[PDB]
Design an enzyme around this catalytic site. Structure first.
Site, PDB file in Angstrom:
ATOM      1  N   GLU A  21       0.922  -1.009   0.107  1.00  0.00           N
ATOM      2  CA  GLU A  21      -0.080  -0.093   0.115  1.00  0.00           C
ATOM      3  C   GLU A  21       0.971   0.948   0.115  1.00  0.00           C
ATOM      4  O   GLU A  21       0.512   2.189   0.569  1.00  0.00           O
ATOM      5  CB  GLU A  21      -1.162  -0.079   1.095  1.00  0.00           C
ATOM      6  CG  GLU A  21      -1.972  -1.200   0.783  1.00  0.00           C
ATOM      7  CD  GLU A  21      -3.326  -1.395   1.684  1.00  0.00           C
ATOM      8  OE1 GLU A  21      -3.364  -0.651   2.556  1.00  0.00           O
ATOM      9  OE2 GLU A  21      -4.131  -1.871   1.352  1.00  0.00           O
ATOM     10  N   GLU A  48      -5.658  -7.673  -2.767  1.00  0.00           N
ATOM     11  CA  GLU A  48      -6.239  -7.500  -1.499  1.00  0.00           C
ATOM     12  C   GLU A  48      -7.851  -7.013  -1.814  1.00  0.00           C
ATOM     13  O   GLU A  48      -8.047  -6.154  -2.529  1.00  0.00           O
ATOM     14  CB  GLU A  48      -5.934  -6.602  -0.642  1.00  0.00           C
ATOM     15  CG  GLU A  48      -4.463  -7.043  -0.003  1.00  0.00           C
ATOM     16  CD  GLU A  48      -4.274  -5.940   1.259  1.00  0.00           C
ATOM     17  OE1 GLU A  48      -5.214  -5.246   1.769  1.00  0.00           O
ATOM     18  OE2 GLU A  48      -2.933  -5.836   1.475  1.00  0.00           O
TER      19      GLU A  48
END
Length: 357
Positions: A162, A281
């Site tokens: 991320e 994800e």
């Protein structure tokens, strides 16, 4: 090679019983790839888990003079050796954007910086990250004898979970840092695939707007990520994106269609560049006023029908112990995303899709 996968972040510090339970659950459910953390930065975070990987600069494993601690490289060695037995492939992420397990901010604290994004710019930080990643990629697994560099159970290295750089909305800082670090990893390990591990944000691409005008910041470059530019880097082998409409500001009635458009857009862009793409994800909160299984089915159908290479839910857990055990004995659902190998409609859907992919 196309797959249903999942994520689990505790494979580098929990017990053999708990690691075996996640990997056995993955095998039993047909989940072929598990994305795991390969970091534990900072003395406080290591001490909190009594497990050490990178407590201070230049210290890899347990500090001299500390007894009774776990070595996170030994726990990762156990997880990799068990994954190898059980036929599970692993994606191993090398630093966190966020503060959990130390992350970029822990490197900034070590080096006296003043903002998270100094992680990408300070050459003393970049040097320490390279020293960590070289130690880990060269590490000899104590259960198999094979260094991670030569271990086919590892499918890919990822640079940073991320990653964001809000201080440079041009995208240029992260393009430079991804080029530098992905090339560095290929210089250490010519065998393995490399990907970034980012969420997939766009940076104001003509004709790409969000469904329903919500979560526009994911389309307009606010996080400093230009996903198309990152995917075009020669030393990046596949594109990653994540999907969390509830966190991102989408309304419940729009989760399904926002997600569907985000998947369509990423697969279209990756297919034009000509590299594989993984939804690595995704999650809907268990308490959302929509049918979560039906949203997951929609999204997995889209990945499958449009020719995406993988879809990995966040996240799979197994049996728990100690202070991480819930009313059924499992590791608890702390975030509202947990799936376990039980009779839930989500578990049943994953077993069904793992037969299709």
């Amino acid at each position: 090679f196309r797959f249903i996968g999942s994520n689990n972040y505790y494979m580098h510090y929990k017990s053999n019983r708990m690691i075996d339970s996640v990997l056995e659950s993955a095998r039993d459910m047909g989940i072929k790839v598990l994305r795991i953390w390969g970091f534990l930065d900072g003395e406080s975070y290591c001490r909190d888990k009594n497990t050490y990987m990178h407590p201070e600069p230049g210290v890899f494993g347990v500090p001299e003079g500390i007894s009774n601690a776990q070595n996170g490289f030994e726990r990762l060695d156990y997880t990799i050796a068990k994954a190898k037995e059980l036929g599970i492939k692993l994606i191993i992420v090398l630093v966190n954007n966020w503060d959990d397990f130390g992350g970029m901010n822990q490197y900034v604290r070590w080096f006296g910086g003043t903002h998270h994004d100094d992680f990408y710019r300070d050459e003393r930080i970049k040097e320490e990250y390279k020293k960590y990643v070289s130690f880990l990629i060269n590490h000899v697994n104590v259960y198999t004898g094979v260094p991670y560099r030569e271990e086919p159970t590892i499918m890919a290295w990822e640079l940073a979970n991320e990653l964001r750089c809000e201080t440079d909305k041009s995208g240029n800082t992260l393009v430079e840092w991804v080029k530098e670090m992905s090339s560095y990893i290929k210089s250490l390990d010519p065998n393995h695939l490399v990907a970034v591990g980012d969420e997939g944000f766009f940076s104001n691409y003509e004709g790409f707007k969000p469904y329903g005008g919500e979560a526009e910041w994911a389309y307009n470059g606010w996080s400093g990520v230009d996903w198309k530019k990152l995917l075009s880097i020669e030393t990046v082998d596949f594109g990653t994106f994540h999907l969390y409409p509830s966190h991102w500001g989408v309304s419940p009635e729009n989760y399904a269609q926002w997600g569907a458009k985000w998947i369509e857009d990423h697969i279209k862009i990756a297919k034009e560049i000509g590299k594989p793409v993984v939804l690595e994800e995704y999650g809907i909160p268990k308490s959302a006023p929509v049918n979560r299984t039906a949203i997951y089915r929609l999204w997995n159908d889209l990945v499958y029908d449009l020719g995406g290479d993988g879809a990995m839910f966040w996240m799979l857990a197994g049996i728990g112990e100690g202070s991480d055990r819930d009313e059924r004995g499992y590791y608890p659902d702390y975030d509202g995303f947990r799936i376990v190998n039980d009779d839930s409609p989500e578990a049943e859907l994953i077993r069904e899709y793992a037969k299709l992919f």
